[PDB]
Amino acid sequence: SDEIVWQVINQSFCSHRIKAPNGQNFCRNEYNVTGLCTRQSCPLANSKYATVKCDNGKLYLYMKTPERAHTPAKLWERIKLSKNYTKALQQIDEHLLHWSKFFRHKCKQRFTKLTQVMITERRLALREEERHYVGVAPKVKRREQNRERKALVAAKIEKAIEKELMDRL
Amino acid sequence: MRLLVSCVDSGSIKEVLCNIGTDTSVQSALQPFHVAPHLAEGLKAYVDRMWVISEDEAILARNSGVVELVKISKHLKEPKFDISEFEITSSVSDLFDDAKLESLSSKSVKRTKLVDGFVTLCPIKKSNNTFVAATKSGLLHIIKKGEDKKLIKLASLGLKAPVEFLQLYDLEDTDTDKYIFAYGGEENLIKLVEIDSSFQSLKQIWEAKNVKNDRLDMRVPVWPMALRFLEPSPGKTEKGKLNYQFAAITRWSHLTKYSTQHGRKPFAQIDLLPNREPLSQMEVFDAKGENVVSSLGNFQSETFNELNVITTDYKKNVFKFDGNGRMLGKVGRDDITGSSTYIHVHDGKYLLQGGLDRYVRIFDIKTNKMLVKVYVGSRINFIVMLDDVEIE
Amino acid sequence: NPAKSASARGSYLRVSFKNTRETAQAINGWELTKAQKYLEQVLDHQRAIPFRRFNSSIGRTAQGKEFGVTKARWPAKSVKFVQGLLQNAAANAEAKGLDATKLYVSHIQVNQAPKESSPSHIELVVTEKEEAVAKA
Amino acid sequence: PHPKIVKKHTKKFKRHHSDRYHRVAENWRKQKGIDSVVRRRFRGNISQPKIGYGSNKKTKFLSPSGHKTFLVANVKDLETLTMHTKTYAAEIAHNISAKNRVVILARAKALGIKVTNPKGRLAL
Amino acid sequence: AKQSLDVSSDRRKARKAYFTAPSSQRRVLLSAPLSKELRAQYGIKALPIRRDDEVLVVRGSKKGQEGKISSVYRLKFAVQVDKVTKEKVNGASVPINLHPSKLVITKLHLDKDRKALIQRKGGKL
RNA sequence: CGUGGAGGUCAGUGACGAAGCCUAGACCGUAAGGUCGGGUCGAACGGCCUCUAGUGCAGAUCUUGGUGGUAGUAGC
RNA sequence: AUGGUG
RNA sequence: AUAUUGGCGAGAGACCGAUAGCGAACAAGUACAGUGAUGGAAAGAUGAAAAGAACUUUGAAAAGAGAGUGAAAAAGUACGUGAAAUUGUUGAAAGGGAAGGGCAUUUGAUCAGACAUGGUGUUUUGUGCCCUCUGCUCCUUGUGGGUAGGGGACGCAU
């Protein structure tokens, strides 16, 4: 039962966990709220869980329960969510009903964030056509510098000037 | 060979004469016989498009807004070969309107002003003197050349401007008399217009509508660049709907495969390239060098999967794709240095090439080797293959 | 400035590091042919060459009054090698097309070599001093 | 925001006699010599490390600009920061190529995360 | 996988045995692929290279150049194809070595042992 | 905390430059240490969970190598 | 101490 | 059945990776020393390929310069990487009786120093995942997904 699956995840390793330089350690699972694998956010030890996730469409609320626990290929249920931030939030705290406060409180947030993200990405889609990033490989550098140096060296550069001036005379 | 190439610098038409295998990049390879300017009228008058029904008769579309007419004849040279002389028999002038365009130059994303020019010149029908000449500005000058030896203006007609491309659907037959164009352009969905031999009457029989909003719940842009028809679709022919199939290229790299019987949306719009790579023109080739096409280029067969196309960017690249979009591969990859302005599949077994690079190039479809390369020293927008010739 | 310059190099000489060192240092900045003049005048026991560094067992000598020092010496071996360096540097210079009237020694260097002798590696870049270096 | 960030001691500790010798390095090590001056803490000598310098659990590990630091490699990794853009800022482990950095960049502005070390390997 | 107890997987061995291998064995380690038209033509895949025949170059900076082998150099595990040529600046022309795996064989040089060879593996001709 | 190798795991990173070395650059650790920015370089390498050691240097008239002062000295 | 070269 | 550091072949390693491991990865019981028994070293790496630098030049010279080859001589048989000690040059800075460290500022130099460029509304106007018709599909059959066509005016753009 689940608390064991936790404690196994809290001593042995998850395939996914991060341990940032400060003491706290993320959880890189695709499906979770908050992205920190701790007792109440780690999707692998809950058995009852709900998050929000983008499809590339709008934001499907994914839900699971104990009953499909053994049937992973289809475990997560899924719902879409409206384009009304207001109506969305009402849908979210709708489906979640007596799901404990954690998931309403947080799921709502993940919605807010991903929506904002969308909006930004929409702005940035419209901006600054100019000055893309570019890398330059190292040997590109070395090559350019040297070949240039030799370029100048080859041109004694005054002989051209004077000879052009004797020309003009 | 004997070819013609439009020289944008002097506004002339060069003729090129040489064998398969030519290159000017080295003194070793075999050399061109002849290159000639002709009838160079200046940067304004450079040739926008060119058509030759039969070897002596070639019609000029001239960016001054002037259609001319060209009589061709061989004569002694100066081994052995012949060249020709190019002089204009007929003309009809001032066919453009700039100001209507200039009023919309603000909405487009392109450069500064928008010149009026010929986006189509061709015969109708495939045995006929008729010519449908298109302008940027929407003005359709339909002009049959009278047997008087002279060109005569049949009509000027309107379009929903500007008009980037226009196509005539000949795949059925010469007979049925009622002609379909498809045209499109800036933020301008693809439109099917029809015209009677009364040549005063155009009703718009069909119009596409754009695909649904994209991943970001934003709106995909609308810019159809080029359109090539197929046969009507086999199967049960359906209520109230025209039966046609056609496929179109957008600036935004979308390949767009339209089947009317399905409806107004495209049933496949597939980006060929990463992140909105701008494309241009089009060619429909076939794998084996085979000739699958009409004389104005519409591919002949009723299933897309059998389609293969050549499309260019604005930089160097020239690509070969299937109906699905899976890239067959680049052409001239290691060679082309510049914007490739013009490409025309010839005989299904050849590839015309030329552009800003100033090398006219000729590649082979199946081998994918460069056959011919000539340095005209000019930007060249257009190429026509005249007689393939013997060399004496 | 490399565009107007000439380089002579020498390496794997067998000399004394210290003597070659100083006798290199003495001419830094001098005009070309006045330099040759010097090395000539100093090889024949006229005007010896001051040693500011290694002064043990160096007899007080008058002519050093030019440089601010009572100590100097007439080293044989050194001014030979650096002499030649000035020769070939003049060759490199002329075939370059430089101007011997502007030509002076902009850089001179010696530094040690493997091994028990004290071989040397010498570097000199002469260049033609130009009137009017930089506005601004 | 955050409290005001106070280091308690901002100068790196050096090993006794580090500079008078090269055969000795600059990484702090203790003095076990029971006679030594640095061990018995005579006036005027260097300052040992000792626990009291330990910083403030609130702002500990905070980079100055106020975020923390979290060290990412590919984009799939920074997606863990969709939640915390207000606490963690993420930077790009050194060996990343110049090919993928630009990807982490674009996507990292869309999310609105602060990348401490952009401009690494990227020109314009 | 390695089932047979008596083969060995050691890297260091197989390196040694590769660099000590005698010219007999350096014959067959040079097997080069026949081109496709030959793959069907003589009904086979790749056959040890000899001196006189004609070959085409697929990989390497030499792409598309082809010729008939001048000599074949079994000490340096190479083959010197004709008219694939460096020129030291004095005009002398040194053959670029081409390791054979990267070659494809256009024209054979058919000898009676090339006949019986092509026959032993099952090629029809 | 760090070093050498191992069993997992990051579908980790890497010729668009892995290691390594320089650094009058930055940040993090109280510290052991860590992590990034430039620079040189060319082919492997790292983080988390655990195992195992030939695992951490200022010294030993320490060993081996390289260098100096002694000094162009006593001297030949 | 054993066994050896002078 | 057991023994086995020698021989003659094999297969392997949580072994060592050039001061390690055999003493010896290389022309090692080699050069060497001893009268003789005997004692016994150091020393691996260009590159993809020698294309190991034509040719002109100073110089008898050892070397140098111009010029090329190579992706890189910033890889030239002193050759991958190139550390420290220690030395030369150029510049800084102080010094004349000392250097070094600790707490603190000063002055000089010097470096870093956002693709921040929005948010909340309010209106005008197109489009569509909105409205209204008409379907189709998969299954955890539920307060669900997926998808098409004809039209019309909640998210998006303006």
From Swiss-Prot, chain A:
Positions occupied by motif Nuclear localization signal: 138-143
Main location: nucleus
Subcellular location: Nucleus
Gene Ontology biological-process entries: maturation of 5.8S rRNA; maturation of 5.8S rRNA from tricistronic rRNA transcript (SSU-rRNA, 5.8S rRNA, LSU-rRNA); maturation of LSU-rRNA; maturation of LSU-rRNA from tricistronic rRNA transcript (SSU-rRNA, 5.8S rRNA, LSU-rRNA); ribosomal large subunit biogenesis
Signal peptide residues on this chain, from the entry's feature table: none
Role this protein plays: Its role might be as part of the apparatus concerned with the nuclear events of the cell cycle.
Family the UniProt entry places it in: Belongs to the MAK16 family.
Name assigned to this protein: Protein MAK16
Full-sequence portion shown in this chain: 2 to 170 of 306
UniProtKB/Swiss-Prot annotation, chain B:
One of the GO BP terms on file: ribosomal large subunit biogenesis
Keywords attached to this entry: Nucleus, Ribosome biogenesis, rRNA processing
Disulphides: none
CDD domains membership: Nsa1
KW Nucleus (keyword) present: yes
GO CC field: nucleolus; nucleus; preribosome, large subunit precursor
UniProt cross-references to InterPro entries, sorted A to Z: WD40_repeat_dom_sf (IPR036322), WDR74/Nsa1 (IPR037379)
Designated name of the protein: Ribosome biogenesis protein NSA1
UniProt organism field: Saccharomyces cerevisiae (strain ATCC 204508 / S288c) (Baker's yeast)
Lineage: Eukaryota, Fungi, Dikarya, Ascomycota, Saccharomycotina
UniProtKB/Swiss-Prot annotation, chain C:
Lineage top rank: taxon: Eukaryota
UniProt record, GO biological process: cleavage in ITS2 between 5.8S rRNA and LSU-rRNA of tricistronic rRNA transcript (SSU-rRNA, 5.8S rRNA, LSU-rRNA); cytoplasmic translation
GO molecular function annotations of the record: structural constituent of ribosome
GO CC aspect terms: cytoplasm; cytosol; cytosolic large ribosomal subunit; preribosome, large subunit precursor
Record-listed cross-link Glycyl lysine isopeptide (Lys-Gly) (interchain with G-Cter in ubiquitin), residues: 37
Phosphothreonine modification, residue list: 61
Places the protein is found: Cytoplasm
Keyword tags: Cytoplasm, Isopeptide bond, Phosphoprotein, Ribonucleoprotein, Ribosomal protein, Ubl conjugation
UniProt keyword S-adenosyl-L-methionine, yes or no: no
Family to which the UniProt record says this protein belongs: Belongs to the universal ribosomal protein uL22 family.
Function: Component of the ribosome, a large ribonucleoprotein complex responsible for the synthesis of proteins in the cell. The small ribosomal subunit (SSU) binds messenger RNAs (mRNAs) and translates the encoded message by selecting cognate aminoacyl-transfer RNA (tRNA) molecules. The large subunit (LSU) contains the ribosomal catalytic site termed the peptidyl transferase center (PTC), which catalyzes the formation of peptide bonds, thereby polymerizing the amino acids delivered by tRNAs into a polypeptide chain.
Note: There are 2 genes for uL22 in yeast.
Name of the protein in its database record: Large ribosomal subunit protein uL22A
Species this chain originates from: Saccharomyces cerevisiae (strain ATCC 204508 / S288c) (Baker's yeast)
Lineage: Eukaryota, Fungi, Dikarya, Ascomycota, Saccharomycotina
Encoding gene, per UniProt annotation: RPL17A
Entire protein: shown range: 10 to 160 of 184
UniProtKB/Swiss-Prot annotation, chain D:
Gene behind the chain: RPL32
One Pfam family of this chain: Ribosomal_L32e
Protein family (similarity comment): Belongs to the eukaryotic ribosomal protein eL32 family.
Subcellular location per the Swiss-Prot or TrEMBL entry: Cytoplasm
The entry's keywords: Cytoplasm, Phosphoprotein, Ribonucleoprotein, Ribosomal protein
Oligomer status and interactors: Component of the large ribosomal subunit (LSU). Mature yeast ribosomes consist of a small (40S) and a large (60S) subunit. The 40S small subunit contains 1 molecule of ribosomal RNA (18S rRNA) and 33 different proteins (encoded by 57 genes). The large 60S subunit contains 3 rRNA molecules (25S, 5.8S and 5S rRNA) and 46 different proteins (encoded by 81 genes).
Domain of life: Eukaryota
Chief subcellular location: cytoplasm
Organism for this UniProt entry: Saccharomyces cerevisiae (strain ATCC 204508 / S288c) (Baker's yeast)
Record carries keyword Acyltransferase: no
Alphabetized PANTHER family for the sequence: 60S RIBOSOMAL PROTEIN L32 AND DNA-DIRECTED RNA POLYMERASE II, SUBUNIT N (PTHR23413), RIBOSOMAL PROTEIN L32 (PTHR23413:SF1)
Function: Component of the ribosome, a large ribonucleoprotein complex responsible for the synthesis of proteins in the cell. The small ribosomal subunit (SSU) binds messenger RNAs (mRNAs) and translates the encoded message by selecting cognate aminoacyl-transfer RNA (tRNA) molecules. The large subunit (LSU) contains the ribosomal catalytic site termed the peptidyl transferase center (PTC), which catalyzes the formation of peptide bonds, thereby polymerizing the amino acids delivered by tRNAs into a polypeptide chain.
Phosphoserine PTM positions: 36
